[PDB]
């Protein structure tokens, strides 16, 4: 009972007809007309599981089905037998209906709906089901779907529970007047325009009702942007809901106002109330006149906001322009009536706005808010003065963790719109021989050969064995020759491909040798190894050469800068096309266009049409988007030219869309759509989101990383995905892991928050630079030196380190890579050091990762020293054109300095790979990781500054030669090095430091030696000094509770310094009197007052007999820094210092009854006396007592025992060998002479009256003697 093999379509989703009668291919969907004299028609049939099939019609008739005229249609094909009504036929035929009347009603089709609204602007419109907006052509340059400015009087979705339209590239109405439209929502929105773009419409001139509307998706135009309407004109809009990605990178010079609901709020009768929104809103303000209010903004003409709550975030590029979370410009172009400003009520946003204000962009004494609420997000904006600095405006009403309770003030959540159309697959049985076990196999082998009699399809299935992996679910397989991912059937059809990769739902494949066992011109079939099954790649082997001869010339003549290409591109003439960075790949794609277009229509469509007229449709289909085809294939080529081992993915994504299922999708069309998608979508950075718009739902895939993750299982399985990532990119990356086994084991964990894995960390969510994975992947050469370290990700330019002494080729590469390993060792040792200190379970935040970007000052090899070049954009720097620029990270870039946004670090004065830049790396780490990192989960002192925590409190010594009490955790240096002389700093950290408890021992001793010498100093002084010698020896310190602009309260005490009076000096007659007069040496200090959060540090041996502890909550800088240094030297950093510098007793202070209002919020205030007691309630009731007991304890400590083994030069260049100071009295006797000589004939002018001064020489003489004498500062007795 042998059947025959004939062409047969099994998944016949629908049949469509087009005619070339007018010289253009046009769809005769209905009212086709009585059969035409000439069969110029060609039948394209759509299949849910296969690409559309094509053939010319051979017969067409019109007969009455039940006295019901229906245009019969027939098609002649080589062997298209149809099992019609369980009866086999020879060639496919169908019957097309006469007409439909679902356009008078706009309920059914989007195309019908747009026509209906255009015949009558004023009408009542209703929707039957959720529908696709893809039905519309979109027009070459049409402004919006509806031309009419007055429309949509009553458009409603209430008839059904809910409905929405998905896939929108244009605004809906373009303008509304007296129009009520509610219950209407959209999903795959992507509206981009060079005009004032509003998602719903451009404007609402009269009162128009916009309610219970829930738009979501992408919105971004070159010129203007409003959340729903571009501007609000006397129109009621409330309970609205736009949650989408909106950005206006284009540097338009107009003062465009963008808004969450309307860019300009202009209605007096109008008002926005109880509305919701979320956004990745960002922009370059530049102009104060331009205003982004986050929630609508540009409040003007008496517009009132009724309890609206939005959760979207702002990332503004320009600090100068005005932008804020709830109001962008309260001020009016008209007169400043408290009333024309508009009103704000019950408003809270969790915007992490940058370079923008928290609540209102324009602050005026008559602010019209009165109901202010804000969330805990980032509002810090960069001042951009000489030094680059970033701070919050601190002029907003802050709220705590009851933001969810505040969210409950919002009345509604959302609606769940019914899903769009389905047109299900409906995936055979009822055959002469059917095996139920082989049913899945029949489905799996239906993929392997299409257009085969269902009987023949099952015949092949019978040949399958029980062991065959076809029994396991088999995803779409693919054919490749020597791992070339061959797509060209017309060329390698004669050629025999090495193997067929049988993809599984396991996400693994199997290899079967192919051979051209049989050749059919209708279809080419191959051998299935020894198993004996057959295999045909799906194609009709039509005459492509004729198409090839005509297509290449017209597409060949195109220009990257061509105005027509720009006209088809979604870009204005003024904007520079730099962002594409596609000019290099524009040239390459054109050079390879013939092979590129060969690989394109090789599998584009199913054509059984020997007739050449049908082939012309394909040629017409291509030229139409020739400009976009070039741009698209160029775009895809630029971003998909990386191989998994030996297999380029370019073929995998560019062609073979079926390999990951959804083979029915049109591969040629996904390219033309991706070319017209618009430069907003094609923007380099937009690749991630463009994976959502184009590469998701066409490949039936969810995430770019997910497809790439799905791809390691398919290619090079048994090799880690991060391993595929690490091996493949040209850039040098290094993931040095910490010595601690538990953290090293965590560095092993591919799981997020523990993995050192760069691929994982870039792929990780909450990483803004996840889009940096494509540009890194396609990097031409090692122009990118990269590092990975605990809770961090290093990134740098070889060209930045390029200069004379560092030749661009090999020599520069060698110094850069070696330096990267050295710095990687320096960074990871500092973090391992910080881990030993951090045992408070704050290791839950141990691996927070932030970027380390370089200056981008990419210098020549010719340049003698570091380059000062901005290298802003469009440079020949391979590093800039292939990386950093594609993942655009615009920065303030100072001529000098290194700043951080709190989520990243930046280097200009220093270099990330510079050894001195390491100290700056910790300085930025002090600025960022502190809030709850170095602190125990309590915010820094209320006044204690952000840069007051590093200059002295917590930073590496700027140099070993530099003298300041500090921890040298960052720098480890050898003992044999000449730097051993005057090292003054820890030679090796992490070895003496194995725990915070060991640090406490290290500083008690370090400060015992400091405490020993300071008393040796004062005694000599209080005892033997001339009255005039006493005047120059000392200084007095005071505290000023001055008004500060940020806080209305003036309670912040500020250390100010001045010379003590002659009468004040006569009074001092005791060492205690120095403690009582609070006067400290003026040797290393000047009377210029110290500004709060100013750069003040602790000199290594400057005597401080002052304990000026403010009854006020904040004390100042040096006193605050100094007393915290002795608090570490007494109590553990967590035990004492953290309480004194984390305002953790604020709740205790409220219990005490001390309070300060902050950000218009009644808040607690914490005082030195209050913390003096918490730390030491009964041990000492005064700071003076605490320091006094430190001293007498200290007196016995030096007196009972001190080593004799202290020998020092402290003499001129001629080396002095051994002081051998046996006892403290001998040291004091020597001290009396050295200080007396220091006070005799003092220059106290010019520079360095300290390192040159005898007292400091002697102070660092016996200090260095101790440092040399003891392996570590472990015990002095």
């Amino acid at each position, epitope marked *: 009972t042998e059947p025959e093999k004939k062409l047969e379509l099994r998944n016949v989703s629908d049949i469509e007809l087009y005619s070339q009668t007018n010289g253009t291919y046009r769809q005769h969907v209905s009212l086709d007309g009585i059969p035409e004299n000439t069969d110029t028609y060609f039948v394209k049939v759509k299949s849910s599981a296969f690409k559309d099939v094509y053939i010319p019609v051979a017969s067409i008739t019109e007969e009455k089905r039940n006295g019901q005229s229906v245009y019969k249609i027939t098609a002649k094909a080589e062997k298209l037998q149809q099992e019609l009504e369980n009866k086999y036929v020879d060639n496919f035929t169908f019957y097309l209906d006469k007409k439909a009347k679902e356009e008078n009603t706009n309920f059914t089709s989007f195309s019908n709906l747009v026509k209906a609204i255009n015949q009558n602007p004023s009408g009542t419109y209703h929707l039957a089901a959720s529908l696709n907006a893809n039905e519309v052509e979109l027009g070459p340059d049409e402004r919006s779907y509806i031309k009419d400015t007055f429309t949509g009087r009553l458009i409603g979705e209430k008839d059904g529970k809910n409905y929405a339209i998905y896939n929108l590239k244009k605004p809906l109405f373009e303008n509304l007047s007296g129009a009520t439209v509610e219950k209407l929502s959209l999903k795959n929105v992507a509206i981009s325009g060079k005009n004032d773009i509003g998602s719903l419409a451009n404007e609402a001139t009269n009162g128009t009702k916009i309610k219970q509307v829930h738009v979501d998706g992408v919105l971004a135009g070159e010129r203007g942007v409003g959340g729903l309407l571009a501007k609000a004109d006397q129109s009621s809009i409330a309970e609205s809901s736009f949650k989408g990605r909106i950005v206006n990178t284009y540097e338009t010079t107009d003062a465009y106002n963008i808004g969450g609901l309307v860019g300009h709020l202009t209605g007096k009768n109008a008002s926005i109330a109880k509305s919701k929104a979320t956004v990745t809103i960002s922009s370059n303000t530049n102009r104060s*006149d331009q205003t982004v209010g986050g929630l609508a903004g540009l409040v003007d003409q008496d517009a009132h906001i009724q309890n609206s709550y939005a959760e979207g975030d702002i990332n503004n590029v320009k600090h100068f322009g005005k932008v804020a979370g709830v109001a962008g410009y309260l001020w009016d172009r008209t007169s*400043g009536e408290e009333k024309h400003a508009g009103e704000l009520t019950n408003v809270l946003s969790d915007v992490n706005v940058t370079n923008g204000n928290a609540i209102t962009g*324009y602050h005026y004494t008559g602010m019209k808010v009165a109901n202010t609420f804000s969330s805990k997000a980032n509002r810090v904006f960069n001042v951009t003065l000489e030094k680059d600095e970033v701070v919050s405006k601190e002029s907003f009403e802050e709220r705590g963790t009851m933001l969810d309770a505040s969210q409950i003030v919002s009345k509604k959540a959302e609606i769940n719109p019914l899903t769009l159309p389905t047109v299900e697959p409906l995936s055979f049985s009822k055959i002469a021989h059917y095996q139920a076990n082989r049913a899945l196999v029949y489905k799996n082998i239906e993929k392997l050969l299409p257009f085969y009699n269902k009987s023949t399809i099952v015949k092949y299935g019978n040949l399958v064995k029980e062991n065959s992996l076809l029994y396991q679910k088999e995803l779409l397989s693919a054919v490749m020759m020597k791992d070339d991912q061959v797509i060209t059937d017309i060329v390698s059809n004669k050629q025999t491909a090495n193997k067929l990769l049988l993809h599984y739902n396991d996400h693994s494949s199997e290899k079967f040798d192919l051979k051209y066992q049989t050749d059919f011109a209708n279809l080419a079939e191959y051998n299935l190894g020894n198993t004996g099954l057959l295999y045909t790649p799906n194609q009709f082997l039509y005459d492509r050469d004729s198409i090839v001869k005509e297509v290449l010339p017209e597409l060949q003549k195109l220009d990257y800068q061509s105005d027509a290409i720009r006209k088809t591109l979604g870009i204005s003439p003024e904007v520079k096309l730099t962002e594409l960075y596609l000019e290099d790949q524009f040239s390459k794609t054109k050079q390879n266009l013939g092979d590129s277009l060969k690989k394109l229509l090789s599998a584009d469509a199913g054509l059984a049409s020997d007739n050449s007229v049908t082939r012309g449709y394909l040629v017409d289909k291509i030229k139409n988007n020739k400009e976009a085809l070039l741009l698209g294939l160029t775009y895809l080529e630029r971003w998909y030219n990386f191989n998994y081992g030996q297999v380029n993915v370019k073929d995998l994504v560019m062609y073979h869309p079926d390999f990951f299922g959804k083979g029915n999708t049109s591969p040629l069309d996904t390219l033309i759509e991706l070319g017209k998608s618009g430069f907003n979508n094609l923007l380099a950075k937009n690749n991630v989101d463009t994976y959502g718009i184009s590469l998701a739902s066409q490949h039936g895939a969810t995430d770019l990383f997910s497809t790439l993750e799905h791809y390691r299982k398919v290619f090079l399985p048994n090799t880690s995905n991060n391993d595929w990532f690490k091996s493949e990119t040209k850039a040098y990356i290094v993931e040095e892991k910490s010595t601690i086994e538990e953290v090293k084991t965590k560095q092993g964990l591919a799981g997020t928050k523990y993995s050192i894995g760069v691929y994982d960390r870039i792929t990780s969510a909450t990483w803004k630079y996840r889009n940096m994975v494509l540009p890194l992947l396609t990097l031409p050469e090692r122009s990118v030196f990269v590092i990975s370290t605990m809770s961090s990700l290093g990134f740098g330019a070889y060209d930045r380190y390029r200069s004379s002494d560092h030749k661009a080729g090999k020599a520069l590469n060698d110094f850069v890579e070696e330096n990267a390993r050295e710095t990687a060792k320096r960074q990871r040792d500092h973090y391992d050091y910080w881990y030993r200190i951090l045992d408070e379970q704050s290791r839950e935040k141990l691996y927070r990762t932030i970027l380390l970007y370089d200056a981008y000052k990419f210098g020549d090899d010719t340049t003698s020293g570091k380059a000062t070049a901005e290298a802003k954009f469009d440079s020949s720097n391979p590093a800039m054109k292939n990386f950093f620029g594609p993942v655009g990270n615009k920065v303030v870039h100072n001529q000098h300095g290194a700043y951080a946004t709190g989520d990243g670090v930046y280097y200009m004065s220093y270099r990330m790979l510079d050894k001195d830049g390491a100290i700056t790396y910790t300085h930025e780490m002090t600025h960022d990781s502190d809030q709850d990192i170095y602190l125990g989960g309590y915010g820094r002192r209320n006044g204690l500054g952000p840069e007051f925590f590093a200059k002295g409190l917590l930073q590496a010594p700027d140099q070993p030669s530099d003298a300041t009490i500090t921890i040298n955790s960052i720098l480890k240096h050898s003992k044999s090095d000449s730097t051993e002389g005057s090292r003054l700093q820890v030679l090796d950290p992490t070895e003496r430091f194995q725990n915070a408890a060991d640090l406490q021992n290290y500083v008690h001793n370090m400060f015992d030696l400091i405490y020993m010498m300071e008393y040796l100093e004062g005694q000599s002084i209080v005892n033997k000094l001339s009255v005039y010698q006493k005047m120059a020896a000392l200084r007095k310190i005071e505290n000023k509770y001055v008004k500060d602009p940020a806080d209305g309260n003036e309670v912040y005490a500020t250390n100010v310094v001045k010379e003590l009076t002659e009468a004040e000096a006569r009074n001092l007659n005791s060492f205690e009197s120095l403690i009582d007069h609070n006067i400290l040496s003026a040797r290393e200090y000047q009377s210029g007052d110290y500004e709060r959060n100013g750069y003040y540090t602790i000199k290594l041996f400057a005597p401080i007999y002052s304990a000026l502890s403010s009854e006020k909550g904040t004390p100042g800088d040096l006193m605050g820094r100094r007393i915290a240094y002795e608090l570490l030297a007494a109590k553990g950093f967590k035990d004492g210092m953290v309480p004194y510098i984390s305002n953790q007793y604020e709740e205790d202070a409220k219990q005490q009854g001390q309070t300060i209002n902050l950000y218009g919020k009644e808040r607690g205030l914490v005082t030195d006396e209050l913390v003096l007691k918490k730390v030491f309630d009964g041990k000492y009731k005064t700071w003076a007592e605490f320091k006094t007991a430190m001293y007498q304890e200290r007196v016995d400590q030096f007196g009972n025992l001190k080593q004799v083994t202290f020998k020092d030069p402290t003499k001129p260049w001629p080396s002095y060998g051994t002081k051998t100071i046996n006892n403290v009295d001998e040291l004091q006797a020597l001290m009396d002479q050295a200080v007396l000589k220091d006070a005799e004939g003092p220059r106290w002018s010019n520079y360095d009256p300290e390192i040159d001064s005898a007292v400091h020489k002697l102070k660092r003489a016996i200090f260095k003697a101790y440092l040399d004498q003891t392996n570590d500062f472990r015990s002095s007795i």
Partner: antibody
Amino acid sequence: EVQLQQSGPELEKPGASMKISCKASGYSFTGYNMNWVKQSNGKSLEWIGSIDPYTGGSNYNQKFMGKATLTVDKSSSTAYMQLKSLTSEDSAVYYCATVVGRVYAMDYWGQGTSVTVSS
Amino acid sequence: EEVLTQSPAIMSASPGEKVTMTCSASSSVSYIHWYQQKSNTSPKLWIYATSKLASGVPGRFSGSGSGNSYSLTISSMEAEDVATYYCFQGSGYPFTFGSGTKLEIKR
């Protein structure tokens, strides 16, 4: 109406530095962006730098990069054009501008400051 | 940088005559902003956005342009018309002024 009053005409010696100032009225000084131009008798008139008053923003021409910088005083509603390394070439009338609808002029331009430089 | 090239630098025309100036840029910008200036006086805008006329201007003054080719077209010449002109542009940074053209009477 908005009226702009630049500093009085001044003369300075070359290789020196001077600061001029434009006064503001009848408009939101801070809300409309300011601008500055140099008026050469020998050559046409040429823009130096636009200034944002509310946030003290400053955009500089490549020609005047570092030569001069822009400051502002919101309270006094009066901007400040800061000039350094003054040269005989710098000698000129100056003019503050107010940006409305993307356009610096006619509204508004100050009476003019006849800055001169001399030894 | 975008240059602006007004010509002729000086034009002599009898009252009622047709006078036009030609300015060409180094780049293409959507809008151009004209600017009349009297001799030794602060100048004022006379046209903007290529064709959008400024306030307090007579109807005779007109403007047109596209690509790198721009111009101002005044239908009739008057004594008040005798002034400098600049098609200043601010559409692209840095903002730049026209090369400079001044109307003159033909006497």
